[PDB]
Design a protein around this ligand. Structure first.
Ligand SMILES: Cn1c(-c2ccc(N3CCNCC3)cc2)cc2c(C#N)ccnc21
Length: 270
């Protein structure tokens, strides 16, 4: 039903589908209208009632402003339509880093803290995101709040071992590159290590499988000794040597984070 929603500009497209700017005309709330062709769907879950894309299962399990909320969804002959909340104004973290380069550690601390608190929510809901990166993080520029997006690559969190992966290869851990095996939490800490390096250096540290396997971090920007330690810790080659969400948020570099609105007034011109 596109009598219930008003379609706007095509915000973007790619491996996740095609997302449009939209408005729910009942109350004029800004929304996002995601389209997914059924033939391009990798993983199918099913609601407790019918066969849906696994993204719908995961979204309802985690649907809080750290994770984007799934509002409604429709089934078409050959596509699925998702209705997601849309902040206003927004800029995804990838564009934000492209325009401003390496971020101040106070800003990265706030951004990195919220993502930690955001994926902590996903795991508590039984959801593993499997594609943590700056492209999949939105910045609510008025409130200073980051929202996680794109659950089209995730899975139900499980304590056993994974053997499939349809996420971003430069963010995948070395155990996946060599053995095509990983555990969700430890692989998530690795990608969080890539994400933290990306924020403080302006670009990701690895581009080829050889560097992922070697696990040697070179810093191309001035980074505090504390932030380097936490980054290298998250990027430890053996998964069991990596920190836990608790060990990360107790780290010296993660102390005295700004509140989200504080972050917007100082760093986002709010
Ligand atoms: C999936 N998605 C994107 C989005 C995806 C990709 C891009 N970009 C691709 C990389 N180049 C910059 C543009 C920008 C926004 C925005 C949203 C929103 C919102 N509000 C809600 C749900 N889902 C979204």
């Amino acid at each position: 039903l596109e009598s219930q929603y008003q379609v706007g500009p095509l915000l973007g497209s790619g491996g996740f589908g095609s997302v449009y700017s939209g408005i729910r005309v009942s109350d004029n709330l800004p929304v996002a209208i995601k389209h997914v062709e059924k033939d391009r769907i990798s993983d199918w879950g099913e609601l407790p009632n019918t066969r849906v894309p696994m993204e719908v299962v995961l979204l309802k399990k985690v649907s809080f402003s750290g994770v984007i909320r799934l509002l409604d969804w429709f089934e078409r002959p050959d596509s699925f339509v998702l209705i997601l909340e849309r902040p206003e104004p927004v800029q995804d973290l990838f564009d934000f880093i492209t325009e401003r380069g390496a971020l101040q550690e106070e800003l990265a601390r706030s951004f990195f803290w919220q993502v930690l608190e955001a994926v902590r929510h996903c795991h508590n809901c039984g959801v593993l995101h499997r594609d943590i990166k700056d492209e999949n993080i939105l910045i609510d520029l008025n409130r200073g709040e980051l929202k996680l997006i794109d659950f089209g690559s995730g899975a139900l969190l499980k304590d056993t071992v994974y053997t499939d992966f349809d996420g971003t290869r430069v963010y995948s851990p070395p155990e996946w590159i060599r053995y095509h095996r990983y555990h969700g939490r430890s692989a998530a800490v690795w990608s969080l290590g890539i994400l933290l390096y990306d924020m403080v250096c302006g670009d990701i540290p690895f581009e080829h499988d050889e560097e992922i396997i070697r696990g040697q971090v070179f810093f191309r920007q001035r980074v505090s000794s504390e932030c380097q330690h936490l980054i290298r810790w998250c990027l430890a080659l053996r998964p069991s040597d990596r920190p836990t969400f608790e060990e990360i948020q107790n780290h010296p570099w993660m102390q005295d984070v700004l509140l989200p609105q504080e972050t917007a007034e100082i760093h986002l011109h709010s």
